[PDB]
Design a protein around this ligand. Structure first.
Ligand SMILES: CN1CC2(CNC(=O)c3c2[nH]c2c3CCc3cnc(-c4ccccc4F)cc3-2)C1
Ligand SMILES: [Mg+2]
Length: 290
């Protein structure tokens, strides 16, 4: 099938949208502000990039990805002058449900189940699949870039941030780090801490120890552990691919996976002072796996 290419608008964005000062996110590449379409009054998000080759690649690759139901949608892209600099202003659908793990952490029940984790991974998996099959690797799949459409329990999860995406034609192992990200996310979903070796807090993984500590992992099947191990495999030549992953019975039959109660929500609350550290370890790790 054939799709339309990206048409960058040159008219001033203020002809079309009201632009507020409320920041809805921060990025080592620019900011995200709140805005409203003038004629319809619909709310939208605005990502601002200083125009450059990298910004252009971000917008292009994200444009290709945009129609995926589990990737955030680009409504329009503008090339404008702002504050004395030439910018790409990107209008996206509003995603005000919060980040993936904040939600889980906030569950007053502390009632999160293996099945729920499966369905979430199928969602993320679908984004990665859409991308990998058009030879794009995202390369920044991590907690802060996964957001929900609304606060509704039934909100859709969306992958954001194409700042590190690249075309992978002829360098297939670029896709691998997206798979490791899936492994890491799945592991945190299942227990509340990442599979990282790393005062007034429990140590969840001892340095060098077996990866699935009994307190939190005792009721998780060996099949699931094997799935994680395949995703986390050290060697990119041996790591699971997105096709193998989306063909796995635990993902393919997500809705019929056991509702094993998990420690995830309680651990996220217990360890909340360490979350920034978690995100920072993952970011540093990503920089070396890309
Ligand atoms: C670290 N966070 C993720 C962050 C960085 N890079 C992005 O592309 C990015 C980021 N946040 C967003 C986006 C684009 C889609 C997007 C859409 N909507 C929101 C958003 C809208 C209303 C209220 C709160 C929100 F987070 C926020 C984002 C800021
Ligand atoms: Mg989409």
């Amino acid at each position: 099938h054939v799709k339309s290419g990206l048409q960058i608008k040159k008219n001033a964005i203020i002809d079309d949208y009201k632009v507020t000062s409320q920041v809805l996110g921060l990025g080592i590449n620019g900011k995200v502000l709140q805005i409203f379409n003038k004629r319809t009054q619909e709310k939208f998000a605005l990502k601002m990039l200083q125009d450059c080759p990298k910004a252009r690649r971000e917008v292009e690759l994200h444009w290709r990805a945009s129609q995926c139901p589990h990737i955030v949608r680009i409504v329009d892209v503008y090339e404008n002058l702002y504050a004395g600099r030439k910018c790409l202003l990107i209008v996206m659908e509003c995603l005000d449900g919060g980040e993936l793990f904040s939600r889980i952490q906030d569950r007053g029940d502390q009632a999160f189940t293996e099945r729920e984790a499966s369905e979430i991974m199928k969602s993320i998996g679908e984004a990665i699949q859409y991308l990998h099959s058009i030879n794009i690797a995202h390369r920044d799949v991590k907690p802060e870039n996964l957001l929900y459409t609304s606060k509704r329990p039934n909100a859709i999860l969306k992958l954001t941030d194409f700042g590190f995406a690249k075309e992978t034609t002829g360098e297939k192992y670029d896709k691998s780090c997206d798979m490791w990200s899936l492994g890491v996310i799945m592991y945190i979903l299942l227990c509340g801490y990442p599979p990282f070796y790393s005062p007034g807090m429990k140590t969840r993984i001892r340095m060098g120890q077996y990866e699935f500590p009994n307190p939190e992992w005792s009721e998780v099947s060996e099949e699931v552990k094997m799935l994680i191990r395949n995703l986390l495999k050290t060697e990119p030549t041996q790591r699971m691919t997105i096709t193998e992953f989306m063909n796995h019975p635990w993902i393919m039959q997500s809705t019929k996976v056991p509702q094993t109660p998990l420690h995830t929500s309680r651990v996220l609350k217990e360890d909340k002072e360490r979350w920034e550290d978690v995100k920072e370890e993952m970011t540093s790790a990503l920089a070396t796996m890309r």
